[PDB]
Structure 1
Amino acid sequence: EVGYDDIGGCRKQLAQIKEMVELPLRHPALFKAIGVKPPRGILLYGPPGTGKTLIARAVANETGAFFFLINGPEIMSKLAGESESNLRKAFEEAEKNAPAIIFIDELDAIAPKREKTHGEVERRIVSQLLTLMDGLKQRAHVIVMAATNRPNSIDPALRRFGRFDREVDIGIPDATGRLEILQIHTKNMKLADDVDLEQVANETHGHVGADLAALCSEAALQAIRKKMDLIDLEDETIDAEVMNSLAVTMDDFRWALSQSNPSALRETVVEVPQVTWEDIGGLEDVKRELQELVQYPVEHPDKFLKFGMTPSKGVLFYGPPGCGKTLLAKAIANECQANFISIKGPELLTMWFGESEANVREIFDKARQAAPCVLFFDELDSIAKARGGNIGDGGGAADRVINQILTEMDGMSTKKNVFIIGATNRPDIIDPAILRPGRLDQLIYIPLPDEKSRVAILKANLRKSPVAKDVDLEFLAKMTNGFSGADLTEICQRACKLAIRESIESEIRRERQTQTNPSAMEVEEDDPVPEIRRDHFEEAMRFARRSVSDNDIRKYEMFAQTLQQSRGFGSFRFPS
C-alpha cells in the first residue's frame, strides 16, 4: 500500500504530522492511563494537487488507523435531508473502528460559509457537521483531518477550538522535493541513463506533485509516440520486452517541460535559499553583523537570555542597486537553514494601487507558519518612489502598505522566529517610522563590491559557463574600478552571448562547407569554440558600463554619515 516512501517532496510537514499522530494512534492505550487531550482535528491546507489526501492515506496506513474518506461533493451531491444521514453514518462507522482517521477531502464544499453563508440546506450541513465535530466525546481515537485550499475559505467556526485546532500548510514542493517527487513518479518506466532528473527538477520550478506526475506521463507519451509507432507492431497487449527497449530521453523530458503549464506558478514560494556566502565575495563586516543579528539568538539563545537582552528582529539594507542585498539576505537565510520569503516591490505596489493592504496580514501569517523564516521586503521604498520622492504627495511619508507592515511588525515578535529584512536603494525617502525601535532599526550599508569582492562576483557569475584558464579574472576585477554586481553580471552575460554567437555562426558555416563540398571522409574537428576565451571577454568589456554613478554613492555616503555616532564621546573613559 501507500506509505512514507510514496509521500514525496520531503517538505518536512509530513514529519510534523507524524509527530502529531503517532502517539494518538501508534500508542492509543497510553492516552487511556494519562490525562491529556490529543489532536481532535488537523487541517491540511495548500495548493491543490499537493498530495494532502495521499499524505492522510499514508499516515493512516503507516499507523494502522482505519482510514475513512468523506468526499466533499460526494455528500454535497446527495439529496438534501439525506446527506446529513451520510455524514452521521460516516462518523459512526469511523467511531466503530477505533482508532480511525476520517479524512474530509475538499472541506471548502461542505462548509464553505465564510459568514456570507448563502442558501438554506448548506447552513444545515455546516451546523450539523459542527455538532458532530464538537460532539466527539473524547472517547475512542478518531482523528478528523480535512483538506482545504486556504484556511480562510472554510467556515470560521470549523477553525475554532476543538473542531480544527491545528493547521499544516503542505505548500508547493521545493527543488529537493520536486526531485524526490520526480523520483517517486519515475520508478517503473525504466528511465534512461542520460536523463538524470536533476536538471529537470531545477527547471521544474512552479510545478506541484500532480504537475510533476503529469509532466512525467507526458514525457512517457512522447517517448511512446516517437518510437514503437513507426514499427506499428501492435497487439492486444504490447510485449513487455518491446516496451522496455525504449528509454525516456532527455529531449522528451525537455519537451514535456516546455508543455507543462504549472498549476500555480503565482503562488508564493516558501523555500530555503540555495545561495551561499561563496556567491558574495566579501562584506565580512556586514557578513559578521548579519550572522550576529540572525544566527546568534538561535544558536545561543541561553546567552541572550542570561544578559536579559532581546535581539533585534529587523534589519534594513541600504545601498546602490545591484550590490547584492537580495543575495546577502538569501545567504543569511541559508546559513541559518531557515525558510526565506521575498516580497518584491511589484507586490507592494500592487497592494498599494489596489488599496488592498490586508494581504500584508496574510503574508505575515504565512511567514509565521513557516518558522524559522527570513521575511525579506525587497525594495521597500517602491511606494515612496511611486508617490514621488522630490516633492511627492502633499501628505507625509506614511502610506497604507507601510502602515500595515508596521502594524504587523508591532504585533509580531511574538513568534520569536520571523526575521524582517528590508532592502532600499533610496534610504532618504523611506518612512522614518520604519527605523524606530521594534522595527527595522539595524541599518546596514552595502557598499560597491571591492576588488576582491568583484573577483568573487565574477567567479560566481562564470562558474557555470566554460571559461578558459587563459582569461585572468583577477585582472578583470581590478580593471573594473567601480562596477556594481549588476554591471559585472552584464559583462559576463555579454561575453557569453558573444561566444555563443561566434560558435553558432562558425558551426553553421562549417556545415555549409560540407554541404557545398561533400568531403570523402567524415572527420568532425569538434567545436571551434569550446570555451570562453580572452578575445570574447575583451570584446564584452569593450561595452562594459558603470550603472551606478558616483553622485548617488555620494548621497549614500551622506546618509551613512547621517547616522553619525556623535563627535565627543570617542574618548569616553570611566573615572578610575
Structure 2
Amino acid sequence: RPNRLIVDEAINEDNSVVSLSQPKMDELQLFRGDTVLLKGKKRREAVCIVLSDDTCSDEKIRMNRVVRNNLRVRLGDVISIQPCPDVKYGKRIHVLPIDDTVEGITGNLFEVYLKPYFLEAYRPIRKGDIFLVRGGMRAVEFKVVETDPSPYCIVAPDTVIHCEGEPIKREDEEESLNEVGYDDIGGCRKQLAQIKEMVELPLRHPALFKAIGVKPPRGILLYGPPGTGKTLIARAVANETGAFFFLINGPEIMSKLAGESESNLRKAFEEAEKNAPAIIFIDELDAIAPKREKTHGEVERRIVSQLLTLMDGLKQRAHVIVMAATNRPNSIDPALRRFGRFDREVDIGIPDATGRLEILQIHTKNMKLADDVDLEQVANETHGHVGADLAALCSEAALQAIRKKMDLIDLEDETIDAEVMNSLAVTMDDFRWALSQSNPSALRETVVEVPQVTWEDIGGLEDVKRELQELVQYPVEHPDKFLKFGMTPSKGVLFYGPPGCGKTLLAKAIANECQANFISIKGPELLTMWFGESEANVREIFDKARQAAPCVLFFDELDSIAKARGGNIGDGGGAADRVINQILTEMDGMSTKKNVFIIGATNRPDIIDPAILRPGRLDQLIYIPLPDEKSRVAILKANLRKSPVAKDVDLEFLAKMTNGFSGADLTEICQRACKLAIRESIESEIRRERERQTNPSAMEVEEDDPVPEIRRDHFEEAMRFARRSVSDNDIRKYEMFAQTLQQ
C-alpha cells in the first residue's frame, strides 16, 4: 500500500502546504497547485496543496502543527493521502473566532485579519478545521462552521464571507467521538473481546468479506441492568473501528406525532444505508417493542411490524450492523429472535470487585488524590453497584471535599479556579461518608463471580477434596481421554451430613480451584417459588447457569421442600412436587457439551424424594464427617488470621479438648473471644476518659492507648460459654444410612 505515510516536521510555516518528494510525486501523478484529501485518525479529513521538496524523505511528509491538531495526530503516526481533483469552488462561508482569542480586541475581524490572509490565497477549507491567524500582537484562532458547497470549497475573489457572531467555545462538548476508546472500559474483558472478535471483520475489511461469500451478522443484543455501560460499549467499538455511529432513542421515536413515528425510523434506516459501514444503535428496545399480549392499542403493533419489515429488508444492501439494548431478555417480543433478525445475545453483567476497582481507578483521573487512598477496600465494600453509581460517588466525594474546605469568604473573582482542584485532595472520611450516603441499585440480582475461598481456608478432609477434584477437574482438563475411551462423566454430587460441617466452603473452594463462575440458590428462595412462579424462576436460573458456562450451580437446603411439606398444613405438596419436577425436567434436558456442574447439599437425607437419586441425575453420595484432631487445628488456624492476633499461644489443646464440635462452635468461640477483648478495651478507654475529666491536664502528652492484648485469660473466659451445636443421635442415624448405602 503506497498510501501509508509517516509524518514529519515541515520547513515552511504556511497552513495549507505539505512538502512531497519527487519519486512519490511522479508515482501518484500530482501537479503544482492541485488539491488532495488527507485522512487521519478519529475520522478527520483535510484538504491541502501539494508542494515539491527534495529534502523530505519518501516515507516522511512535511506538515505543520495546525494540520496535525486538525487531524488529531502526532509525530510518528501514519496518515493516508488521496488525490482530490473534484474540488468545487465555494460561494459563501461562515467563520467564527474561538472563545479564548478575542479577549479585549473589540474590532472588525474582516479587515484586520481576514482580508490580508484571504487575498489571492486560494486556500481550501473543510468543516472542523482549526487554523491560526498571525497579525499585530495576537494569534487569532478561527472556526469555519458553514460553507457552500459543503464540505469542500475554495476561497475566491468572487466569494462572500461573514464573521458576525459570538466567540464559539474550544470544541463545545464534542469529546465522545474523540474519547471513549478501549481505555475507558473496565471490568468487561470477556464481553468486549467477544464483540471485537465478531464485529471487526465486517467493519474493517468489507471487500474481502464480500469476496468470500459468507453471511455477516445482522443483529446483536446487549442486555443487562441499566447504567452498566452498554451504549458506551457501542460508542467505543464504533469510534475505534471507524464507522458512522447513528443513535436512535426509544421514547423520542415513540411520541413524535400520532402516526408519523415510523416515517422517522424509516428515514434513519435510509440515511444509514447510504453512508458507508455504519452502526445503528436502538436504545430501550422494550419501550417500543414489548410483548404482543401486553400491547393494548394499535399504533404499537404498527410500529413493531414496521421495525420487523425494515429489519428483514437488510438483505445484502451494505455493511450495516444493528445493535440493540434491553433490560430483561424475556421482555422483548419473541418474534424478534428469528434467524436473520437479532440472533446473537451478549450479556453485560454487574461488575465484580476487580471490575469495581478498575472503574474507580478510571474515573479518579482528573482528581488529585492524597497519599492515603487505598481503593481496594473502598471497592470491596460496595457490593451492589454499577458504573453510574461509582461515577456519582466520585462526584459527591469531590463536592464533599469542597464542603470540608469551602471558599472561605473567598470573593468569587474567577481568580480561584485552577488552585481549586490544584490545592485539594480526598481522604478516607469523604469516601466513607459517600458510601454511607449512597443508594445501591443492584441489590436483588443473582451474582455470577469466581469465589475467593481456597483449599487452605477449609481444614483436613483430604479424601473428599480428592474425590471432588477427581469428578470435576479431570473431565474438563483431559476430555480427550474420556471421548476416546467412551464414557459419560457424572453430572451431580449430593452432600449429606450433620449441619455446620462446611459444605458451602467446599463448594466455593472447588469453584475457585476450577476457576469457574458460582451461582447460589438458597433455601428461602426455593421455598418462596412454590406459590405460583414455579416455572419461570427455574427457567431463567437454569438458562443463566447455562449461558455463563462454566459454572457450579449450588442448591442449598434441598430437604426444606419436604420439611415444609410435612406438618399441620399439607397444602404445599402440589407446590413441592411442581418445583421438584421443574428441577428434574430441566436437569434431564442438560447436554454434556456445556460444562455445567450441579451440586446439592442437605442435612436430612432420609426424606429426599427417591426420584432424584437415579443415574443421569444427582447420583454420587459423599458423606461429610465431623472434624477431628488435625481438622480442628486447621480450622482454628484458618479462623485465626485477623489483624490483631498478637503472638498468642498454642491451639493444639483447644482442638484436643472439644469432641463433638462442628465449625459453627469454633467460629462462635472465636467471635466470643474478640467480643470480650473489645469490651475490655472499651471499658479501659472509658476509665481513661473519666480520669482525664477528674484530673485536667493530667495526660497532656499523648500516652499510648491499650494495645490489642488478646490474652489467654480473655480467651479462657470467653470460650467458657462453650455450646454443643449438634446432638449425638443424629450421628448414629447418618452412619446407619451410610452403612445402608454400602452393600
Q: Please tell me the TM-score bracket, short chain as reference.
A: over 0.9
> Alpha carbons of 1:359 and 1:397: their partners in 2 closer, same or farther (altered >3 Å)?
closer
Report SS of the residue matched to 2:448. Answer: coil
Partner residue, 2:600: 422
> Alpha carbons of 1:512 and 1:433: their partners in 2 closer, same or farther (altered >3 Å)?
same
Tell which has more relative contact order, 1 or 2 (C-alpha 8 A, sep 6+): 1
- Contact between 1:69 and 1:102, CA under 8 Å: does it hold in 2? yes
> Alpha carbons of 1:172 and 1:531: their partners in 2 closer, same or farther (altered >3 Å)?
farther
Alignment partner for residue 227 of structure 1, among 378, 401, 405? 405
Deviation at 1:304, TM superposition (A): 1.3
Deviation at 1:417, TM superposition (A): 1.7
Separation (CA, whole Å) in 2 of partners of 1:494 and 1:61: 58
Report SS of the residue matched to 2:322. Answer: strand
Deviation at 1:353, TM superposition (A): 3.2
Partner residue, 2:487: 309
Alignment partner for residue 137 of structure 1, among 315, 318, 322? 315
Deviation at 1:358, TM superposition (A): 2.0
Identity %: 100
Point out the more displaced range, 107-116 or 264-273: 107-116
Deviation at 1:324, TM superposition (A): 1.1
- Contact between 2:447 and 2:519, CA under 8 Å: does it hold in 1? yes
- Contact between 1:389 and 1:429, CA under 8 Å: does it hold in 2? no
Cα deviation 1:123-153 (Å, max 9, x = unaligned) = 1111111111121113322111111001111
> Alpha carbons of 1:514 and 1:364: their partners in 2 closer, same or farther (altered >3 Å)?
same
- Contact between 1:483 and 1:548, CA under 8 Å: does it hold in 2? yes
Number of equivalent positions: 565
Separation (CA, whole Å) in 1 of partners of 2:562 and 2:180: 53
Cα deviation 1:245-281 (Å, max 9, x = unaligned) = 2221111111111122210210111111111111111
Separation (CA, whole Å) in 2 of partners of 1:456 and 1:24: 57
> Alpha carbons of 1:185 and 1:237: their partners in 2 closer, same or farther (altered >3 Å)?
farther
> Alpha carbons of 1:224 and 1:13: their partners in 2 closer, same or farther (altered >3 Å)?
same
Deviation at 1:521, TM superposition (A): 5.7
> Alpha carbons of 1:143 and 1:444: their partners in 2 closer, same or farther (altered >3 Å)?
same
> Alpha carbons of 1:298 and 1:114: their partners in 2 closer, same or farther (altered >3 Å)?
farther
- Contact between 1:195 and 1:249, CA under 8 Å: does it hold in 2? yes
> Alpha carbons of 1:30 and 1:444: their partners in 2 closer, same or farther (altered >3 Å)?
farther
Separation (CA, whole Å) in 1 of partners of 2:367 and 2:258: 46
Separation (CA, whole Å) in 2 of partners of 1:139 and 1:454: 71
Deviation at 1:385, TM superposition (A): 1.0
Deviation at 1:355, TM superposition (A): 4.8
Cα deviation 1:38-77 (Å, max 9, x = unaligned) = 2211100011111011111111112112211111112112
- Contact between 2:565 and 2:573, CA under 8 Å: does it hold in 1? no
Deviation at 1:237, TM superposition (A): 6.4
Deviation at 1:459, TM superposition (A): 2.5
> Alpha carbons of 1:453 and 1:229: their partners in 2 closer, same or farther (altered >3 Å)?
farther
Point out the more displaced range, 5-14 or 57-66: 5-14
Query: Could you say which structure has the higher strand fraction?
Result: 2
Partner residue, 2:182: 4
Separation (CA, whole Å) in 2 of partners of 1:514 and 1:15: 63
Cα deviation 1:174-219 (Å, max 9, x = unaligned) = 1111111111122211222212111011101011111111222222
Point out the more displaced range, 546-555 or 172-181: 546-555
Partner residue, 2:55: none
- Contact between 1:483 and 1:546, CA under 8 Å: does it hold in 2? yes
> Alpha carbons of 1:397 and 1:286: their partners in 2 closer, same or farther (altered >3 Å)?
farther
- Contact between 1:280 and 1:456, CA under 8 Å: does it hold in 2? yes
Cα deviation 1:416-467 (Å, max 9, x = unaligned) = 2211110111111111112211111121212222222222222222313411
- Contact between 1:46 and 1:170, CA under 8 Å: does it hold in 2? yes
- Contact between 2:501 and 2:624, CA under 8 Å: does it hold in 1? yes
Separation (CA, whole Å) in 1 of partners of 2:571 and 2:610: 16
> Alpha carbons of 1:492 and 1:67: their partners in 2 closer, same or farther (altered >3 Å)?
same
> Alpha carbons of 1:192 and 1:451: their partners in 2 closer, same or farther (altered >3 Å)?
farther
Separation (CA, whole Å) in 2 of partners of 1:94 and 1:67: 9
- Contact between 1:114 and 1:155, CA under 8 Å: does it hold in 2? yes
Separation (CA, whole Å) in 1 of partners of 2:302 and 2:296: 11
Separation (CA, whole Å) in 2 of partners of 1:322 and 1:527: 38
> Alpha carbons of 1:415 and 1:401: their partners in 2 closer, same or farther (altered >3 Å)?
farther
Cα deviation 1:384-428 (Å, max 9, x = unaligned) = 111128997796996221111111101113552211110111111
Cα deviation 1:85-123 (Å, max 9, x = unaligned) = 111122222222331111111111121124432211111
1:138-287 mapped onto 2 (5 Å cutoff):
138-230=316-408, 232=410, 234-236=412-414, 238-287=416-465
Deviation at 1:540, TM superposition (A): 2.0
Report SS of the residue matched to 1:433. Answer: coil
Kindly name which structure, 1 or 2, has the bigger radius of gyration based on alpha carbons: 2
Report SS of the residue matched to 2:741. Answer: coil
- Contact between 1:499 and 1:532, CA under 8 Å: does it hold in 2? yes
> Alpha carbons of 1:11 and 1:315: their partners in 2 closer, same or farther (altered >3 Å)?
farther
- Contact between 1:72 and 1:107, CA under 8 Å: does it hold in 2? yes
Deviation at 1:516, TM superposition (A): 2.3
Report SS of the residue matched to 2:573. Answer: coil
Report SS of the residue matched to 1:443. Answer: strand
Report SS of the residue matched to 2:302. Answer: helix
> Alpha carbons of 1:449 and 1:119: their partners in 2 closer, same or farther (altered >3 Å)?
same
Deviation at 1:24, TM superposition (A): 2.0
- Contact between 2:530 and 2:572, CA under 8 Å: does it hold in 1? no
Separation (CA, whole Å) in 1 of partners of 2:305 and 2:336: 10
Separation (CA, whole Å) in 1 of partners of 2:419 and 2:677: 45
Separation (CA, whole Å) in 2 of partners of 1:139 and 1:317: 58
Deviation at 1:383, TM superposition (A): 1.3
- Contact between 1:115 and 1:155, CA under 8 Å: does it hold in 2? no
Deviation at 1:357, TM superposition (A): 3.3
- Contact between 1:384 and 1:430, CA under 8 Å: does it hold in 2? yes
Separation (CA, whole Å) in 2 of partners of 1:514 and 1:548: 49
Deviation at 1:350, TM superposition (A): 0.8
- Contact between 2:521 and 2:554, CA under 8 Å: does it hold in 1? yes
Partner residue, 1:456: 634
Separation (CA, whole Å) in 1 of partners of 2:472 and 2:284: 39
Separation (CA, whole Å) in 2 of partners of 1:477 and 1:195: 41
Separation (CA, whole Å) in 2 of partners of 1:215 and 1:192: 17
- Contact between 2:351 and 2:386, CA under 8 Å: does it hold in 1? yes
- Contact between 2:495 and 2:623, CA under 8 Å: does it hold in 1? yes
> Alpha carbons of 1:555 and 1:355: their partners in 2 closer, same or farther (altered >3 Å)?
farther
Deviation at 1:317, TM superposition (A): 1.2
Point out the more displaced range, 79-88 or 309-318: 79-88
- Contact between 1:11 and 1:170, CA under 8 Å: does it hold in 2? no
Separation (CA, whole Å) in 2 of partners of 1:428 and 1:120: 57
Report SS of the residue matched to 1:58. Answer: helix
Separation (CA, whole Å) in 2 of partners of 1:531 and 1:168: 54
Partner residue, 2:567: 389
Deviation at 1:18, TM superposition (A): 1.6
Point out the more displaced range, 40-49 or 381-390: 381-390
- Contact between 2:546 and 2:594, CA under 8 Å: does it hold in 1? no
> Alpha carbons of 1:355 and 1:427: their partners in 2 closer, same or farther (altered >3 Å)?
same
Report SS of the residue matched to 1:561. Answer: helix
Separation (CA, whole Å) in 2 of partners of 1:268 and 1:418: 17
- Contact between 1:367 and 1:373, CA under 8 Å: does it hold in 2? yes
- Contact between 1:352 and 1:383, CA under 8 Å: does it hold in 2? no
TM-score, normalising length: structure 2: 0.73
Deviation at 1:491, TM superposition (A): 1.1
- Contact between 1:368 and 1:415, CA under 8 Å: does it hold in 2? no
> Alpha carbons of 1:386 and 1:32: their partners in 2 closer, same or farther (altered >3 Å)?
same
Point out the more displaced range, 387-396 or 341-350: 387-396
Report SS of the residue matched to 2:622. Answer: strand
Deviation at 1:233, TM superposition (A): 5.2
- Contact between 2:352 and 2:449, CA under 8 Å: does it hold in 1? yes
Separation (CA, whole Å) in 2 of partners of 1:451 and 1:527: 38
